[PDB]
Amino acid sequence: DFSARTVITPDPNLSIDQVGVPRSIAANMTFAEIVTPFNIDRLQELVRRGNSQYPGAKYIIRDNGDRIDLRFHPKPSDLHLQTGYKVERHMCDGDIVIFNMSMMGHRVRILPWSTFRLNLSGDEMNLHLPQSLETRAEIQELAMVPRMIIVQDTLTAVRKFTKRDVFLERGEVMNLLMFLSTWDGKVPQPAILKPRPLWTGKQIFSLIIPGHINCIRTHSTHPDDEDSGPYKHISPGDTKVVVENGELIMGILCKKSLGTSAGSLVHISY
Amino acid sequence: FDQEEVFEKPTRETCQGMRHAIYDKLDDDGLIAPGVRVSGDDVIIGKTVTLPTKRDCSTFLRTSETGIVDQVMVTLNQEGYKFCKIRVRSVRIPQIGDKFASRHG
């Protein structure tokens, strides 16, 4: 079911795997699903919605293979469905879609506006929906973006964020930790308890690092003689990146440390 | 000689083959008058062919955009047959999908 091509726009809120799709495009696209007692009511309500309402079904297929259009709705009995039927319900949230021979699958999220939303981390594209459940399960198991693998607007801020100069007040820390999905729920102890609490950028980023991964990297502006000098461990410019037990003890992150490479935080975590 | 095109309202009775659409927009002459809002699939000019009963061959909107006809022009082509042009006006509001470019870059 090839869709109409539309321009691409960024969306940091969406996950990299997730993809934004408008209501109109999803309405045209249909996903055949086999009705089961555990979800008999779910298909019963969606078919009742009709094609005028977005959460509807374009067609319903009986066991014999006959397709009945839901636009007309001639008889209520025909609307009723039995177990084992196939219903071409319109695409909804949580469905798996695949687009650009290696293709990466995505989880569709419905958004109000028209243009597609992709969490890049422009050019028009057409997203393809796998109708069969078997290939849909296979796509979500091996063709997803996490198994396939940062924007330039984040790497520049990351370097500033991890600078020793950056200090975060209690109010600022709250907002940053709210967006942290992988948060244990406990606020870390401030680095500078007195005269006032002040969390360093690394402390907030320490929770961002998942689990306990240890790696040593160097900042781009790392003098060669610094490593040979007595201050190798205590970097005068914080140009040495060291992580212990998943905590960024020191060092300013950058493309060399956080960006994809032979050795990097993302690569080590993978 | 046997079959010719004409401009008129494609009534459901006189016309055998037709496409599901709203035909109230067309006037008695088969041309939509200026000032009528048109949205989705709608007939804006009526044309039929008297095949050897007539078959509908009207022209619908190229896209589904909602627009209002601005002006209607009726003329005679070089061959002398009746020829008309109509300009459909639509208003596009900038949105998240529109592409904006500076004077350079």
Partner: peptide, 4 residues
């Protein structure tokens, strides 16, 4: 593009 989308209306097409």
């Amino acid at each position: 593009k989308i209306h097409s």
